[PDB]
């Protein structure tokens, strides 16, 4: 019918009067701020903190928990649903972390959504404007399709390394940040594939199959140590903080930054590649967004924890040393890639310099935060040994 069959309490005269009659003269409590008991990180409580903090029903025996008692159902053997035992790090409160960007689901999917549509428009303007005419064929067919294409597996691996953390994180705020750091990585891997499939559409003969890139990843030399480090970070680490720390504050801050910025993004121009830099800018923004959360969590909350500051820095110093080696090895193998470039593309001085850029930013943004003694010359030379 026109008015329908179901009668609603807000608009049905009879029902509405019943409801309106039962109503109190005024709110039974004037405290209308959900989450009012949560300690603000900033001036006033934010919608992000309000909707997120304490959603995790941790009891007080997990630092910061408001509930009490044991879990109602545990694993066979006794492992608790969530517990202090799933990570070496200790804190006064697992709910202290705050994503400096205050991202809850709605804002997160909204920006990515925007970027998706901007990407779509970008490609349509790119193919229609025929800008593919300027890209060097060999850079397009060898370096982008094969080497940049293999890197998608690296980003995919870093994504998967987050799976255990999505299950083990000890708080809501860390779980959300962690989840968003990971989703951003699978997104980058997908953007790498999105570009290849786009090229396959505008460039005759261009094959979008991942067979070539993947063959490079699983059996080539350029990414051998890279794949080893990734496989390790993902499947040999059962501690969710070692995984997130080592990936973002060690491996990706060094190897990832170099490959994305100091290689591809830095050489695309010299080959008329204006396509790849577009997606790399996203990955770089993503890296920058994640870093802020990573720093807050590991340096601001745990690294500066009032009771475990000294303990946690020892552990992260431990982790940096444990993973710095594989990362140096990954970079070292990657040096073999420069020998493949057309002669005169770049020189040993530029390479070294970019290495110092990546290493120096890492020491300032991460190493120093935990008093990890990094020797920039030692690291760089250890890597340069890879230049064929």
């Amino acid at each position: 019918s026109m008015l329908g069959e179901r009668r609603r309490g807000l608009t049905d005269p009879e029902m509405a009067a019943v409801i309106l009659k039962a109503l109190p003269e005024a709110p039974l409590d004037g405290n209308n701020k959900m989450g009012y008991f949560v300690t603000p990180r900033w001036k006033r409580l934010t919608e992000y903190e309000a909707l997120t903090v304490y959603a995790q029903p941790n009891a007080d025996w997990i630092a910061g928990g408001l509930d009490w008692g044991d879990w109602t159902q545990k694993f066979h053997g006794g492992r608790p649903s969530w517990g202090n035992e799933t990570t070496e790090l200790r804190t006064v409160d697992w709910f202290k972390h705050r994503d400096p960007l205050r991202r809850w689901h709605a804002p997160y999917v909204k920006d990515k959504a925007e970027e998706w549509r901007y990407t779509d428009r970008f490609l349509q303007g790119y193919s229609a404007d025929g800008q593919i005419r300027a890209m060097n064929p060999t850079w397009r067919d060898e370096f982008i399709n094969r080497y940049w294409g293999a890197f998608l597996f690296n980003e995919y691996g870093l994504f998967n390394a987050h799976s255990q953390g999505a299950r083990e994180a000890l708080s809501d705020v860390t779980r959300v940040s962690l989840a968003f750091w990971g989703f951003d990585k699978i997104d980058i891997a997908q953007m790498i594939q999105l570009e290849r499939g786009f090229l396959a559409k505008i460039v005759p003969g261009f094959d979008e199959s991942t067979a070539v890139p993947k063959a490079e990843w699983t059996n080539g030399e350029v990414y051998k140590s890279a794949r080893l480090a990734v496989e390790g970070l993902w499947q040999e680490v059962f501690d969710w903080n070692e995984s997130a720390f080592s990936v973002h504050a060690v491996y990706d801050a060094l190897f990832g930054q170099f490959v994305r910025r100091e290689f591809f993004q830095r050489l695309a121009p010299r080959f008329g590649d204006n396509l790849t830099p577009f997606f790399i800018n996203q990955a770089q923004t993503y890296f920058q967004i994640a870093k802020q959360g990573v720093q807050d969590l590991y340096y601001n909350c745990l690294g500066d924890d009032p009771e475990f500051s000294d303990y946690n820095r020892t552990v992260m110093r431990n982790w940096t040393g444990k993973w710095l080696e594989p990362t140096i090895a990954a970079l070292r193998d990657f040096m073999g890639l420069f020998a493949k470039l057309p002669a005169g593309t770049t020189d040993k001085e530029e390479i070294t310099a970019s290495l110092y850029r990546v290493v120096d930013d890492w020491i300032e943004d991460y190493a120093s935060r935990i008093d990890f003694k990094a020797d920039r010359d030692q690291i760089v030379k250890a890597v340069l040994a890879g230049l064929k």
Binding site: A59, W68, G77, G78, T86
Partner: protein, 166 residues
């Protein structure tokens, strides 16, 4: 004082814990605390309402003491007691796989948790063990899960049937 999140028992233990300043002493007390107060095989149910929280407090001390005592390699690979973490993991798994029944299995898993739970064993080795041990235990337990009548399962478990109502 008899509160839920703050009471005398917790306070007494907090004080006991502050008087631990040797890894060997603190570690031994954590292992002992666990044999005495955790799992359904605990020696006593006297601390049922605070053991969880107290244990975490004791763990906190053993972790801080271990990080200061151990070099980087030992922290990543040795238990707080000086055993090679991996050897313990493999040995326990070996015992698990050789278990004849689900009853031997549960003793091996629960025993493992009471003795090596972090900060005793490094979490990487410990969770890896959780993964293997738990698997076998379930494999033995979930096999023909309903064939034993409750009357008999009660005898097998060994409970003292205090009351029933049909």
């Amino acid at each position: 004082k008899l509160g839920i999140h703050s009471n005398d028992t917790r306070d007494a233990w907090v004080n006991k814990i502050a008087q631990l300043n040797t890894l060997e002493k603190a570690a031994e007390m954590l292992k002992q605390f666990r044999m005495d107060h955790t799992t359904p095989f605990r020696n006593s149910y006297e601390l049922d309402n605070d053991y969880l929280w107290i244990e975490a407090k004791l763990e906190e001390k053993v972790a801080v003491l271990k990080a200061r005592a151990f070099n980087e390699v030992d922290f990543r690979h040795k238990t707080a007691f000086g055993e090679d973490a991996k050897s313990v993991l493999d040995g326990t798994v070996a015992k698990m796989n050789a278990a004849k029944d689900k009853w031997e299995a549960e003793k091996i898993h629960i025993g493992f948790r009471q003795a090596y739970k972090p900060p005793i064993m490094p979490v990487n080795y410990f969770l890896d063990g959780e993964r293997q041990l738990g698997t076998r235990l379930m494999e033995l337990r979930n096999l023909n899960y309903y064939d034993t009548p409750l009357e008999e399962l009660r005898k097998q478990r060994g409970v003292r049937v205090v009351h029933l109502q049909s």
